[PDB]
Structure 1
């Protein structure tokens, strides 16, 4: 209900696999984060887009670098 990028936290992003035994990584911003306070407490802003903001959703839970090397970021 606040910022602006937070509206699209229901809608998902999908990253395509790097290998043959893999299916795509479908992720959403509501899922990765906790609520709202968490989003700004780890350095979220309203001045963002989706891709640049959904990678900050990846990192805080500790799985950026795994995806970075298993999917197309």
Structure 2
């Protein structure tokens, strides 16, 4: 869907656990966002890369810095 980066919303990303024995977090954009407007409201563009959209997307459940220290991010 629109915009340019919203097509990748269904495809997931994986981040490697920083601690030895933990499960890798599988996450997607359509999971961090409800529709389309929320993404553009928080500060989203179509020119964004899939990662840069996901990293911005870590703000739905308010869980970026917590993931930052727990995952390869």
Fold shared, TM-score > 0.5 on shorter chain: yes
Give TM-score, length-normalised by structure 1: 0.93
Q: What are the ranges of 5 or more consecutive residues in structure 1 without an aligned counterpart?
A: none
**Structure 1 ranges of 4+ moved more than 4 A:** none
How many correspondences in the alignment? 73
SS of the residue aligned with 1:14?
Answer: strand
Alpha-carbon distance between aligned partners in 2 of 1:69 and 1:2, rounded to the nearest angstrom: 32
Shift of 1:19: 1.0
Q: Is the 8 A contact 1:42 1:60 kept in 2?
A: no
Shift of 1:56: 0.6
Give TM-score, length-normalised by structure 2: 0.93
RMSD: 1.0
